[PDB]
Amino acid sequence: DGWVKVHPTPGTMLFREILHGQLGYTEGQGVYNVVRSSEATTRQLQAAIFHALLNATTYRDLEADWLGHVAARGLQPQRLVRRYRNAREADIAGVAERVFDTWRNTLRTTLLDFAHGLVACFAPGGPSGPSSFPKYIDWLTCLGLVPILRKRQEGGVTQGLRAFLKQHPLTRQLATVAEAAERAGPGFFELALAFDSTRVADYDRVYIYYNHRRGDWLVRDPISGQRGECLVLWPPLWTGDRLVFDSPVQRLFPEIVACHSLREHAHVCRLRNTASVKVLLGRKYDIIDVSKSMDDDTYVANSFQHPYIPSYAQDLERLSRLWEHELVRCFKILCHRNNQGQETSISYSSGAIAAFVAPYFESVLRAPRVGAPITGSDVILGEEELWDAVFKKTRLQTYLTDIAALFVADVQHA
Amino acid sequence: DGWVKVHPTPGTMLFREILHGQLGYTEGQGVYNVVRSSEATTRQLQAAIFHALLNATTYRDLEADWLGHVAARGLQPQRLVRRYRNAREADIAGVAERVFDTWRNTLRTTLLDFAHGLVACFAPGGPSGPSSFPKYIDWLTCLGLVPILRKRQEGGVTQGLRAFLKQHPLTRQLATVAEAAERAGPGFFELALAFDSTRVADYDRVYIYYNHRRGDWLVRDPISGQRGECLVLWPPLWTGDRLVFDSPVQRLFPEIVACHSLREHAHVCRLRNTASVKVLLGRKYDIIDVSKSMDDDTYVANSFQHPYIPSYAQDLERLSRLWEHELVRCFKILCHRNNQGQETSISYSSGAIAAFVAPYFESVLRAPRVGAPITGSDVILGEEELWDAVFKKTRLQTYLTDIAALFVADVQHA
Amino acid sequence: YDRVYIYYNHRRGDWLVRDPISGQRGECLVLWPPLWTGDRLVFDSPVQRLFPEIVACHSLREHAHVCRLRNTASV
């Protein structure tokens, strides 16, 4: 009733084949490899987890832990001052600030270890398997659509979380991390459930049907008999006779076809010209041409030779430049070049992550709030740098300084 | 029932051949050699072992050892101050600082020697043989798969560890070293067991089967009859007739074939052209072309000479550049180049380790914990620099400074 | 180099090195392993990689010399 088949057509198969370089290849196309990188997704995962865990810190809990450690070490400031029998403010101030600094950086290391354990638990299920990011990105590149199949289930990620959190010894030693983990735990459980639920359709096993009268989609798995959903970022066009996509491969398609045809014709012409001497036969290493087959009351009046051979270097170079420029502009990639003109590194710009990573989470993953998205510089840096940067600004440092200021000032003012 | 062979087909054998330069070779392909480097894995082992050793330190045990050394040297602050008979606190402060600093660097030398022995114990078995890193890399490059055969058994690595730890007299001298080694012992045994258990399949024997109807793999050893696991990083695609892999060699395949065919055609055309003078005969150093063989009731009309010779400089240069660019972008390698654009060294970037080294440990080797991944700068630096860097920021330095300041206060008030 | 004898087996994958004259049995160590492709063996040494190009270059030089010698005549 107005429906038409879309995906199993050979056109999309040819698109995917040209993505793998089945015909033609240029170094400009090589920039596509960084477009499939999962660095941004992992950065977003760890930043969101860091924000979630650290915002659960309690001022009272950390004050209780600090006073418990103080009692355990017996470092009562009045007792230390009386034992030292001096009014040297600088000495006791240095001692107190150093002790608080050692407590703060041991807390930092413990929190870093626990967060690293959590993010390592979450890491494997992101890139490979369910919600595979490269599959989403090459779906958007090939056609501009992201088919999805949803099903509520318990997955291996939840099993890993369960096998991780309970037996972790850090809950027994540090109380504050225990309360922080337990109060936010259902959020991580829901995140794991969302990870399991979302499955991205495999390219060669999914069928897409579109109806043009009303403009609605239908996606189903021929083998599993499961109905899914269709998500579109930039919609296609329906001319009435053929559905015309608007993906970058669609735009690039005619030029690659022309270049490949030219290269094939050049090869065919080159193969013919292997001969050295040619002759002709007519009525009154070597190749003989015989016109006697078609001689019928005829006679040769003249003959000509023109050994053409096509050239294709500039066309390949232009195709490489076009590939590079299109892939740079479409995905808003960021390029770094030095004074002499040498390329140094390729990284995602802030626009790229804001335009692709965030909608991925909000629609393909259906994940809850992810907090403030990272900046373009953060993805370049390392995990420890991101951890320190987020730790400095956020809530925990304010409580830490709040404790430190009064704890220090009390002993010297006394 | 839907199964089909994957590896024994001549395509993968041709891929492995083309890596070894069986056909064609260019300067760009040479950058593959630095990819197979084992420096990153060894640096990761060093960092992991250093972290696993240092965290086992005990503040009480370190204090006990320091006070025992002080008592052995008779460095009682009260007695030494009474002997000096002067009010110069600077002298006693400097003496205490120097003595504790020599204790510091003696502890550091002992720790680094023991750690170097331990890492040397794990050094040979890791990157080569069982769980050999270059085989993992060239499996990823050839196909995108990493066949694995697993078996739980004791290995020579554990034998070396056993020959090391209890035969090391360092435990009898320093209490802290013995206590830390005893605490961290089981983890190293688990690491050795993980090293021995994992075996990477060899290219010439193992067989892998695929089935698209349900998307499953089957890997087995034809001779030993052992069944294993099939790991995939970037999956392939099934287009009915064939299975187009998504490895870099697969992308590069058509261009190399075209270049090699052109070189062969150029050679065969060049060999023919060695003649200087050529003549032809017909019915009424030297080469004679007898057209009389087919000259029957036929008569010549004209003759031609077009001595073509193909050239291949441009294709070779482009292939070299394409090889270099593809290998640089695919594995996220990093280059260092100076003012005039000439390179000086090749390094293993942070993205490279984060995308290859870590999943290798987590899946191929099934390591329990690797700690915080190193930065891209650490692989450049030497072992001693890495040890010194990891020593400074960690718990043992905190304990060391805590002891130092309290001892300085005690000696200055004494 | 010119004395030692090296034997290899493909089904089990083991080596055997012995001195033909002294009769002494030794030990075989490998850094990067070779490859077994049926009725052939392919090493992975740098010279092995460089081999297919040097042969072509030497053949080209030989053919150039052969052609040069012929053209010494004037008429």
Residue numbers in the entry:
A (entry chain d), B (entry chain c): 24 to 27, 29 to 308, 494 to 623
C (entry chain a): 227 to 301
Excerpt from the paper describing this PDB structure:
Three capsid types have been recognized from the nuclei of herpesvirus-infected cells: empty A-capsids, scaffolding-containing B-capsids, and DNA-filled C-capsids. A unique portal vertex exists at a 12th I5 vertex through which the genome is translocated during assembly. Here, portal proteins assemble into a dodecameric basket-like structure that is thought to seed the assembly of scaffolding proteins, in turn driving the formation of spherical procapsids composed of MCP, SCP, and triplexes. A separate protein complex, the terminase, associates with the dodecameric portal and initiates genome packaging and the concurrent autoproteolytic cleavage of the scaffold.
To improve the resolution of the portal baskets, we carried out separate sub-particle reconstructions and refined them while imposing C12 symmetry, leading to portal basket structures at resolutions of 3.6, 3.5, and 3.7 Å for the A-, B-, and C-capsids, respectively. C-capsid portal baskets are positioned higher at the portal vertex compared to their A- and B-capsid counterparts, which has been attributed to the densely packed genome pushing the portal up against the capsid shell. However, our D-capsid portal structures have the same portal basket position as C-capsids despite being mostly devoid of genome. These observations together suggest that genome pressure alone does not determine portal basket height, and the elevated portal position observed in C- and D-capsids may instead be an irreversible step during capsid maturation. C-capsid portals did not vary in height but were still capable of 9 degree rotations and ~1 nm of portal basket sway. D-capsid portals had 4 Å variability in height, but otherwise resembled C-capsid portals. These findings reveal distinct patterns of portal basket variability, with A- and B-capsids exhibiting greater positional and rotational flexibility compared to the more constrained movement observed in C- and D-capsids. The C12 reconstruction of both A- and B-capsid portal baskets revealed a small hook-like density with large aromatic side chains and sharp turns wedged into a hydrophobic pocket between the crown domains of each portal monomer. This density is weaker in A-capsids, but still conspicuous, whereas it is completely absent in C-capsids, D-capsids, and mature virions.
